[PDB]
Ligand binder design. Structure first.
Ligand SMILES: *[C@@H]1O[C@H](CO)[C@@H](O[C@@H]2O[C@H](CO)[C@@H](O[C@@H]3O[C@H](CO)[C@@H](O)[C@H](O[C@H]4O[C@H](CO)[C@@H](O)[C@H](O)[C@@H]4O[C@H]4O[C@H](CO)[C@@H](O)[C@H](O)[C@@H]4O)[C@@H]3O)[C@H](O)[C@H]2NC(C)=O)[C@H](O)[C@H]1NC(C)=O
Ligand SMILES: *[C@@H]1O[C@H](CO)[C@@H](O[C@@H]2O[C@H](CO)[C@@H](O)[C@H](O)[C@H]2NC(C)=O)[C@H](O)[C@H]1NC(C)=O
Ligand SMILES: *[C@@H]1O[C@H](CO)[C@@H](O[C@@H]2O[C@H](CO)[C@@H](O)[C@H](O)[C@H]2NC(C)=O)[C@H](O)[C@H]1NC(C)=O
Ligand SMILES: *[C@@H]1O[C@H](CO)[C@@H](O[C@@H]2O[C@H](CO)[C@@H](O)[C@H](O)[C@H]2NC(C)=O)[C@H](O)[C@H]1NC(C)=O
Ligand SMILES: *[C@@H]1O[C@H](CO)[C@@H](O[C@@H]2O[C@H](CO)[C@@H](O)[C@H](O)[C@H]2NC(C)=O)[C@H](O)[C@H]1NC(C)=O
Ligand SMILES: *[C@@H]1O[C@H](CO)[C@@H](O[C@@H]2O[C@H](CO)[C@@H](O)[C@H](O)[C@H]2NC(C)=O)[C@H](O)[C@H]1NC(C)=O
Ligand SMILES: *[C@@H]1O[C@H](CO)[C@@H](O[C@@H]2O[C@H](CO)[C@@H](O)[C@H](O)[C@H]2NC(C)=O)[C@H](O)[C@H]1NC(C)=O
Ligand SMILES: *[C@@H]1O[C@H](CO)[C@@H](O[C@@H]2O[C@H](CO)[C@@H](O)[C@H](O)[C@H]2NC(C)=O)[C@H](O)[C@H]1NC(C)=O
Ligand SMILES: *[C@@H]1O[C@H](CO)[C@@H](O[C@@H]2O[C@H](CO)[C@@H](O)[C@H](O)[C@H]2NC(C)=O)[C@H](O)[C@H]1NC(C)=O
Ligand SMILES: *[C@@H]1O[C@H](CO)[C@@H](O)[C@H](O)[C@H]1NC(C)=O
Ligand SMILES: *[C@@H]1O[C@H](CO)[C@@H](O)[C@H](O)[C@H]1NC(C)=O
Ligand SMILES: *[C@@H]1O[C@H](CO)[C@@H](O)[C@H](O)[C@H]1NC(C)=O
Lengths: 385, 128, 97, 128, 128
């Protein structure tokens, strides 16, 4: 009758907490490939039989923009890269002189392996299983695991590659649709194959070519994908036409699409993919060209800007044989213009992205928490004294 | 040992009832690295759960609650912490929601529990 | 706000700062919220402003918490209010030519 | 932790005496797979023994016997369960024999223990 | 679980105070063989620490101290064991020094504790 304070132990209550996750992967460790060599000593085998518990009426706020797992993933990837793809020349400005590091320049096999992150003893990872959840808020379907699924540590810009697909629909996951200083990072519910090949055995040199590649995108898939994307953009901007453009300027890694295979760093001109304007869900941007292939002109470079903080690096010249990349476009790191001076139209551009954004699009489903079993509530009992 | 994880989403009242039911039934009797790396990790997780449990069971002695899961007090509710009724909080809230409602008063309450325990122990020894 | 005046085709260094020396993302915008210049990780990007052919930044200072907008070859039309978006805070400087 | 396995075959009375004697003495201070596969299995066996023990020690709270090995009650023997005397059962029977003699009444007894515990708790709270 | 090893060298009084402080803060929330051979040995060490702990917690029931870390008695100091005052021993001595001072009387004391526990239990049952 006095609502006596009663202490209850074993209460299923948790808080977000910071710990360091460990990695696991299905390392082979004998092909002398970078990811398998790294994984050999960096990671443990994956869990052959992980369990998952689905919680009942549980709602949890998942903020993908503040998920610290991202920073941990970032640090492991940098170590992998520094321990593998060694440039001939690495330039680090220091404030403001320049420090130059020179290293042997062997080429290495380089093909990503999925890596899983797992909770240490005493911790667990909450997973958001709501297929319609865009992030930054309440997830109404929460389950618990020790380990996340494996994620392929792909480094790229504009079009992100080989990620996961949405269960049913293309999902916009912007922190703020109307801010204009943040990305859209839309993920797809369908992967679109992009096939990039070198014109093998074409050896030609300029004088006082060799460094060339071509990327082929099905036009049909691209058309379907963009029609669906603009429909979602139209929902956000219901009285406006959607127009796509190329970048306004900036470093080559942003202006063109960037990716790598083996030791080769590719830059591709995506202009052919983004010059449309949908309004009545129709553009005729492609004249029903019947080519069925949107093709990009690509180049292979030796001197590139590093993604790993500010600095520049040079790699050895190209491999003499055939180079091929086969990737899944699984999302677009699109951005939007200011819009303040526009009248009835919104402009989108593919240029953009950095590595933290690429991981946010993969790690948004997971949060790490710990249970604090001691709780208090009032009740009707009294202790005899 | 946190078999109460599956209780998440239930109300505080419901959780209490579920444990009583389970207690009656239980009491009444009603490729090598993939195996050994994880073997160690699972044992570490279970040994740790036991150690934290035992630690807490003894830490609670400071409030006179040693060895117990549920312990009753001699400190009343102050109603500044929350002015809801017992049925409202036990029937329409989960443990997590409840904790959030009063998570800024926990140190106050913890302090009071320590203090009343000290005074009670003192009173008994003075009487003896 | 800070006000800086230049003349004709000369150059101006407008600045934004942070107490956190971690190359934290920032942007510069004009008074109409049109992106001018900003950072995406290690890379410099530009917006569709009249300054894309004039604007640059001292990349070497990004890890010092210094994120300037440097405009060369000023046009009289560039006189405006320039907005710094750094972390969460905003700062402003007016540019007069 | 079942160090009482070696007591099998002794009478209930004898088993009690043996434990008291041991308690005084203890308290008073008076080829790789063959190693690692079994290393894990032995740890699993020991961790489990601890977990079952702790579980039971808390489950017994429902009868007011939490934290105890031996707990006394407020429920009398009904003599329908068995009409033998205390000395007859404690001195001429082993625990297993005893359990068999009354293994069809255990649920009845368990129920009574729960009930008297509830009423006792109620009485104290009503008085307070 | 012997987190008190770091208390060595402190006085008995100081050790008690340190635990109370820690208790409040904790309770209030304020190359393969080199990995697997030792993984097993560390788990064995921790499982054993738990088992000895639980054993002792139940062995102490013989003195009426089951489940406790600190238990108070009904047996007075005889002063033949030691004639120092409480403050002298608690403030100017460490636990080890204290144990040495009286390590030849421990069996006497242990015996007395058993005896008074038996008589107390008897008295209650006779009264009931
Ligand atoms: C998305 O996922 C897909 C797969 O799921 C990734 O695609 C894989 O990309 C790797 C990139 O190399 C590609 O690997 C090549 O497969 C060939 C199949 O036979 C191999 O022959 C080839 O090995 C040679 O080239 C390597 C290039 O660095 C050398 O390191 C290696 O030693 C070999 O080199 C010898 O042969 C060449 C021949 O021209 C010769 O010039 C050399 O001197 C030397 O003699 C690679 O293993 C995979 O096959 C791709 N998978 C598929 C299905 O195509 C994709 O990259 C992911 N996307 C992103 C962005 O990462
Ligand atoms: C949360 O979403 C998951 C994912 O779909 C649901 O669980 C799965 O439901 C499918 C339906 O066919 C089953 O095949 C899976 O085996 C289920 N997975 C698990 C781990 O149970 C889950 O039920 C949803 N939970 C809530 C609360 O809605
Ligand atoms: C999401 O974007 C909108 C629009 O850019 C932000 O709204 C602006 O917020 C500032 C804050 O003082 C106001 O001064 C502006 O007038 C707002 N703009 C408009 C058009 O009203 C909104 O705050 C952003 N969300 C967050 C969390 O920052
Ligand atoms: C990408 O699509 C283009 C479509 O033109 C392919 O180019 C054609 O390749 C065939 C192969 O024999 C040639 O006969 C055609 O003349 C080519 N067309 C043109 C316009 O030159 C291109 O090869 C495709 N890319 C890849 C990697 O196959
Ligand atoms: C990229 O290369 C792959 C493999 O050569 C192509 O995959 C083939 O696509 C056709 C399309 O119907 C299928 O019928 C074949 O079975 C596919 N091959 C395999 C091995 O599955 C893929 O289409 C190419 N991508 C693009 C954009 O052209
Ligand atoms: C991508 O390729 C297009 C060509 O397909 C380049 O754009 C051309 O630039 C010249 C320069 O005067 C113009 O005359 C052409 O009309 C442009 N063509 C198109 C289709 O716009 C474009 O600059 C390249 N972009 C990148 C980033 O390399
Ligand atoms: C893509 O953005 C560019 C701006 O960088 C647009 O080009 C401008 O178009 C207007 C139209 O009158 C011209 O006055 C400007 O001088 C153009 N600027 C430049 C730098 O050329 C371009 O039209 C946009 N394209 C699409 C498809 O929206
Ligand atoms: C966007 O650019 C692409 C290429 O840069 C244009 O598509 C090609 O246009 C030529 C013109 O004769 C056609 O022959 C090709 O077949 C087209 N490609 C495909 C895959 O059909 C495209 O028209 C431009 N779109 C807009 C809206 O400007
Ligand atoms: C679109 O580009 C793809 C690029 O692979 C074309 O597929 C190739 O077509 C040539 C034609 O002889 C075949 O020899 C290749 O083996 C095909 N590649 C693959 C991986 O199968 C595709 O045909 C192009 N589409 C059209 C309509 O030309
Ligand atoms: C979906 O995105 C919008 C963007 O502002 C956000 O406000 C909303 O809360 C998101 N969904 C959930 C469940 O939070
Ligand atoms: C995309 O494909 C659909 C299929 O019917 C077609 O109607 C549409 O015009 C195509 N392209 C655009 C840009 O609208
Ligand atoms: C693209 O997604 C399909 C879906 O099954 C998968 O089979 C294919 O291997 C994926 N491609 C890449 C490069 O991962």
């Amino acid at each position: 009758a006095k609502k006596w304070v009663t202490v209850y132990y074993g209460v299923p209550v948790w808080k977000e907490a910071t710990t360091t996750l460990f990695c696991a992967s299905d390392a082979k460790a004998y092909d002398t490939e970078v990811h398998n060599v790294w994984a050999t000593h960096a990671c443990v085998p994956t869990d052959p039989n992980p369990q998952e518990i689905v919680l009942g009426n549980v709602t949890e706020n998942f903020n993908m923009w503040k998920n610290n797992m991202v920073e941990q993933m970032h640090e492991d990837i940098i170590s992998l890269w520094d321990q593998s793809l060694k440039p001939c020349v690495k330039l680090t400005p220091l404030c403001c002189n320049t420090s130059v590091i020179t290293q042997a320049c062997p080429k290495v096999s380089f093909e990503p392996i999925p890596i899983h992150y797992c909770a240490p003893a005493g911790f667990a990872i909450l997973k958001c299983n709501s297929k319609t959840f865009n992030g930054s808020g309440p997830c109404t379907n929460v389950s618990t695991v020790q380990c996340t699924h494996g994620i392929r540590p792909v480094v790229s810009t504009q079009l992100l590659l080989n990620g996961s697909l949405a269960e049913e629909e293309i999902v916009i996951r912007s922190e703020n649709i109307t801010d204009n200083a943040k990305t859209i990072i839309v993920q797809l519910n369908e992967a679109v194959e992009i096939n990039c090949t070198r014109p093998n055995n074409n050896t030609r040199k300029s004088i006082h070519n060799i460094r060339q590649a071509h990327c082929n995108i099905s036009k049909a898939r691209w058309n379907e994908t963009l029609g669906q994307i603009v429909a979602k953009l139209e929902e956000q901007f219901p009285n406006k036409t959607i127009i796509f453009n190329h970048s306004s300027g900036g470093d080559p890694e942003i202006v063109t699409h960037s990716f790598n295979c083996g030791g080769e760093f590719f830059y591709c001109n995506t202009t052919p993919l983004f010059n449309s304007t949908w309004n009545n869900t129709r553009t005729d941007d492609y004249p029903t060209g019947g080519e069925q292939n949107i093709t990009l002109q690509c180049r292979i470079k030796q001197i590139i800007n590093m993604w790993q903080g500010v600095g520049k690096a040079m790699y050895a010249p190209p491999i003499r044989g055939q180079i091929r990349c086969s990737s899944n476009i699984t999302g677009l790191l699109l951005t939007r213009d200011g819009g303040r001076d526009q009248n009835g139209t919104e402009t989108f551009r593919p240029g953009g992205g950095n590595m933290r954004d690429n991981w946010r699009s993969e790690l948004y489903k997971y949060k790490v928490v710990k249970i604090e079993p001691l709780g208090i509530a009032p009740t009707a009992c009294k202790r005899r004294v | 040992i946190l078999g109460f994880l599956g209780a998440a989403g239930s109300t505080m009242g419901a959780a209490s009832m579920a444990l009583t039911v389970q207690a009656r039934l239980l009491l009444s009797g009603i490729h090598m690295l993939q195996l050994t790396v994880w073997g160690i990790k699972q044992l570490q997780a279970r040994v740790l759960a036991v150690e934290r449990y035992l630690r807490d069971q003894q830490l609670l002695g400071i409030w006179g609650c040693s060895g117990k899961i549920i312990c009753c007090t001699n400190v009343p509710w102050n109603d500044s912490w929350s002015n809801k009724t017992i049925n409202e909080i036990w029937d329409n809230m989960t443990w997590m929601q409840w904790e959030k409602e009063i998570d800024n008063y926990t140190q106050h309450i913890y302090t009071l529990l320590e203090v009343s325990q000290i005074q009670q122990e003192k009173n008994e020894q003075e009487l003896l | 706000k800070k006000v800086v005046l230049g003349k004709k085709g000369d150059t101006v260094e407008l600045t934004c700062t942070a107490s956190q020396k971690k190359s934290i993302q920032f942007h510069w915008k004009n008074s109409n919220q049109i992106k001018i210049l900003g950072n995406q990780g290690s890379f410099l990007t530009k917006g569709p402003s009249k300054l894309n052919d004039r604007a640059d930044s001292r990349r070497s200072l990004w890890d010092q918490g210094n994120f300037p907008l440097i405009i060369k070859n000023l046009k009289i039309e560039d006189s405006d209010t320039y907005i710094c978006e750094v972390e969460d805070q905003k700062e402003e400087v007016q540019l007069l030519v």
